[PDB]
Amino acid sequence: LDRERIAEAALELVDRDGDFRMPDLARHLNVQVSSIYHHAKGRAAVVELVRHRVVREIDGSAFERLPWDEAFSEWARSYRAAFSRHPTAIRLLATETVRDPGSLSVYHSAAAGLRGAGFPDDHIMAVITAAENFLLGAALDAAAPEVMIEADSTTTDDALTRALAAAPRGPERAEQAFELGLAALLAGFHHLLQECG
Amino acid sequence: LDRERIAEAALELVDRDGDFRMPDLARHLNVQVSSIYHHAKGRAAVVELVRHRVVREIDGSAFERLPWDEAFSEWARSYRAAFSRHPTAIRLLATETVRDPGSLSVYHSAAAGLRGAGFPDDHIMAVITAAENFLLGAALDAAAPEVMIEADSTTTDDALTRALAAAPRGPERAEQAFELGLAALLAGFHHLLQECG
């Protein structure tokens, strides 16, 4: 029983149900809640351990090594991949305040990278949050069925039929939308930067 | 007991737990599963009724009345507002194939609007899905706490501290990120269109 084993069991419960309760977590660790509190004080601390375990693969330090848009793209891909492994954890983690030191570090890196690029301070958090909104959505879409829209029509030339026939099939469907949306957002952010001088 | 009352009770369960089970739904309607199946055959049909009840407010027909980017903005705002009332339903609805006639109609409208604008057919579904990815994420962020990042630092001039101090407070935090991300995506999509001639 250390922090890593608590984080593990908690994420397992969150994977199954979308949330966890302290006594049930203790049961699955064969301990009393007491024992958990010695490693992590309260629910908020256990949520941050869950967050830590999900986001471990996300490297923010790419912002120190690459131009902002290339770093943004590496960071975005890692973020998608991390959350797409735990789609049932997305609601919980998107709606609890971030305090995990590891996560705060990633934020520190993205903020410094975007400042370095010329994004004004009053825009930096919105840029990062706009990107995260898209990425949590794309993580859900990567966990979704490969066919997400099934239309029952007799028409062959309407716009929806045509668009659905001309789109990628399989895992490529979600990948196409993710790549196009990422490129569109980066183009938008580049525009923001031109406007700022 | 009609389709509307089934849709209602099912969404109530989904709001609470993130999913529903047929027998529990029947219990909360004081009926046997049998009675549900006469209005909606199986789980997939009940999921689409849930979808219908969430997305009723979303008007796709704005694509018939406004230039694509103005329509996109009205549609996006309605979509955010709808899902932000039921954040616990987002996972389920983002990961089940769309067959609800009302929803398919909205897709029909957005597809025709984007075709009308000049987006090539092989790009239309990805454009719509990219937008939805962002919007589901923004719906979660609107249901999130107004302070989403709490940093414990002694530093005053670092990039994260500065960005968090210069950002909007309260409900304005999520609103700022939503507005900036929407504008960035539309700029990106406008760029896509310039590239296409």
Side-chain angles (χ1 to χ4, degrees):
Chain A
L1 202 76
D2 49 283
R3 282 170 69 84
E4 174 187 338
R5 178 104 184 196
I6 293 168
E8 149 68 18
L11 181 51
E12 192 154 29
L13 289 172
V14 171
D15 276 337
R16 201 189 64 203
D17 305 325
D19 206 345
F20 69 98
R21 279 177 188 117
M22 289 295 305
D24 205 48
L25 170 57
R27 201 172 293 120
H28 285 86
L29 283 158
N30 186 41
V31 290
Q32 303 313 323
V33 165
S34 222
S35 281
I36 303 182
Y37 286 171
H38 286 136
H39 295 278
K41 300 231 302 290
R43 182 181 165 79
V46 173
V47 173
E48 296 313 290
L49 288 173
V50 172
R51 189 192 312 282
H52 166 72
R53 190 162 220 265
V54 172
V55 305
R56 280 208 92 147
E57 115 170 63
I58 306 180
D59 193 10
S61 74
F63 285 100
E64 295 168 24
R65 294 185 298 270
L66 295 167
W68 73 276
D69 49 344
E70 288 173 2
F72 201 93
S73 165
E74 296 307 310
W75 168 74
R77 297 169 187 274
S78 284
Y79 189 112
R80 186 173 171 257
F83 283 94
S84 83
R85 299 192 196 102
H86 301 96
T88 312
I90 286 173
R91 183 233 109 222
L92 173 68
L93 298 173
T95 62
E96 296 300 326
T97 302
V98 180
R99 306 191 178 84
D100 172 56
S103 300
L104 290 177
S105 178
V106 169
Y107 288 112
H108 273 291
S109 295
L114 293 170
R115 193 141 190 252
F119 287 97
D121 292 350
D122 59 352
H123 282 75
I124 291 172
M125 296 312 304
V127 170
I128 292 167
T129 301
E132 285 190 276
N133 289 342
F134 170 77
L135 299 166
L136 291 168
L140 293 166
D141 200 40
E146 295 170 359
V147 174
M148 264 301 290
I149 282 144
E150 205 178 323
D152 202 0
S153 311
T154 193
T155 56
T156 89
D157 291 338
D158 69 282
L160 184 59
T161 304
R162 286 196 176 180
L164 285 163
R169 165 199 166 185
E172 201 176 354
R173 184 198 57 74
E175 247 159 39
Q176 194 200 17
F178 164 62
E179 298 283 1
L180 188 156
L182 186 60
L185 222 37
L186 288 170
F189 295 154
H190 265 110
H191 204 273
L192 186 170
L193 223 48
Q194 295 158 22
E195 291 170 20
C196 289
Chain B
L1 202 76
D2 49 283
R3 282 170 69 84
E4 174 187 338
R5 178 104 184 196
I6 293 168
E8 149 68 18
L11 181 51
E12 192 154 29
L13 289 172
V14 171
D15 276 337
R16 201 189 64 203
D17 305 325
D19 206 345
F20 69 98
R21 279 177 188 117
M22 289 295 305
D24 205 48
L25 170 57
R27 201 172 293 120
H28 285 86
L29 283 158
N30 186 41
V31 290
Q32 303 313 323
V33 165
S34 222
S35 281
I36 303 182
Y37 286 171
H38 286 136
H39 295 278
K41 300 231 302 290
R43 182 181 165 79
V46 173
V47 173
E48 296 313 290
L49 288 173
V50 172
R51 189 192 312 282
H52 166 72
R53 190 162 220 265
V54 172
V55 305
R56 280 208 92 147
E57 115 170 63
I58 306 180
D59 193 10
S61 74
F63 285 100
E64 295 168 24
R65 294 185 298 270
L66 295 167
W68 73 276
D69 49 344
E70 288 173 2
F72 201 93
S73 165
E74 296 307 310
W75 168 74
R77 297 169 187 274
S78 284
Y79 189 112
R80 186 173 171 257
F83 283 94
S84 83
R85 299 192 196 102
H86 301 96
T88 312
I90 286 173
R91 183 233 109 222
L92 173 68
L93 298 173
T95 62
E96 296 300 326
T97 302
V98 180
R99 306 191 178 84
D100 172 56
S103 300
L104 290 177
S105 178
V106 169
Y107 288 112
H108 273 291
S109 295
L114 293 170
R115 193 141 190 252
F119 287 97
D121 292 350
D122 59 352
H123 282 75
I124 291 172
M125 296 312 304
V127 170
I128 292 167
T129 301
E132 285 190 276
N133 289 342
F134 170 77
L135 299 166
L136 291 168
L140 293 166
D141 200 40
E146 295 170 359
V147 174
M148 264 301 290
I149 282 144
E150 205 178 323
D152 202 0
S153 311
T154 193
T155 56
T156 89
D157 291 338
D158 69 282
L160 184 59
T161 304
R162 286 196 176 180
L164 285 163
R169 165 199 166 185
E172 201 176 354
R173 184 198 57 74
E175 247 159 39
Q176 194 200 17
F178 164 62
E179 298 283 1
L180 188 156
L182 186 60
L185 222 37
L186 288 170
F189 295 154
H190 265 110
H191 204 273
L192 186 170
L193 223 48
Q194 295 158 22
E195 291 170 20
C196 289

